[PDB]
Amino acid sequence: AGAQDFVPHTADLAELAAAAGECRGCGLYRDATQAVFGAGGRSARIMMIGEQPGDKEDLAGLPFVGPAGRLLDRALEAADIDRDALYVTNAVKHFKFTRAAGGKRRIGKTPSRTEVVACRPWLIAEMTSVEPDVVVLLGATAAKALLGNDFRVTQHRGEVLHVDDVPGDPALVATVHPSSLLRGPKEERESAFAGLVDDLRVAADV
Ligand SMILES: O=c1cc[nH]c(=O)[nH]1
Ligand code: SF4
C-alpha cells in the first residue's frame, strides 16, 4: 500500500504537497527535514521526474535547486524549453541520506525499489493532476518507476516511448540524470550534456 492512504482524493497540487508533508508511506520521512513535492503548475505540458531531493532541496522545499538543477537549467535553456511549461518532481519525495564523517554535504543514497513503489502513488496523483503530454525521466530510478526495474536508460535514451499502464498515455523520454554531467572526463560530460539537450528537444516536440 505504501503512500496510498496518505494521498487525498484531490488533483490540487498545494493540497497534494501539504498531504505529502504528513506521509508515512515508507521510512524516509523520519530523517528528512520535510517532503519535497514538485514545482510548477497543472497547465504544464512537460513533466520531469528525477530520483529524489538532495541536501539543498531537503532544506529548500523545492526540487533541483542545487548543482544538478543548475546543469538541468543550462540544458533546458539550450533546448529552448522555459520552466513555465514544466512540472518538475522526483520518484521519492523524502531525502534518503548518510553522513560521511569528514565529508562536505549529506550524501544521497539510492532509493530501493520498495521506496519508489511506496512513493509512486504521489507521482500517479501528480500525472493525473498535470495531465502531461510528455514525461521526461531523468535517470535510472525515475525510468524504472514507470518502465520497470529491468529498463536500461543507456539502451533507450532519446526514444519516444508509450506504455499502456501509465495514466493518460503520455509520451515518455528517458535520459541521463543531470548529476552524471558533473562527474567524469570533460568530453564524456560534454557529449552527455549534448545528449540531454537532444533528449529534451525530442520531448519538447512531442
Ligand atoms: O530534485 C532533485 C535534485 C537532485 N537530484 C534529483 O534527482 N532531484
Ligand atoms: S518518500 Fe514518499 S512514500 Fe516515503 S514517506 Fe516520503 S512521501 Fe511517503
Numbering used by the authors: 2 to 207
The article reads:
Substitutions of His109 in MsmUdgX with Ser, Gly, Ala, Gln, Cys and Lys showed the loss of its covalent complex formation with DNA but gained canonical UDG activities. We note that smaller and hydrophilic amino acid substitutions at His109, such as Gly or Ser showed higher Kcat/Km values. However, to better understand the mechanism of uracil excision by the H109 mutants, we determined their structures along with a pentameric DNA, TTUTT by X-ray crystallography. The DNA backbone could not be modelled into the experimental electron density map in any of the mutant structures that were determined. Nonetheless, all structures revealed the excised uracil and the side chain substitutions at position 109. The structures also revealed invariant interactions of N91 and H178 with uracil. When we arranged the mutants in the order of increasing cavity sizes (left), we noted that the canonical UDG activity of the mutants increased with their increasing cavity sizes to begin with and then with a further increase in the cavity size, the UDG activity declined (right). It suggested that the initial increase in UDG activity (H109K to H109Q to H109G) occurred because of the efficiency with which the water molecule could be localized to make a nucleophilic attack on the C1′ position. Interestingly, G109 the smallest amino acid substitution of H109 showed lower cavity volume than Ser, Cys or Ala due to an overall structural change near the active site.
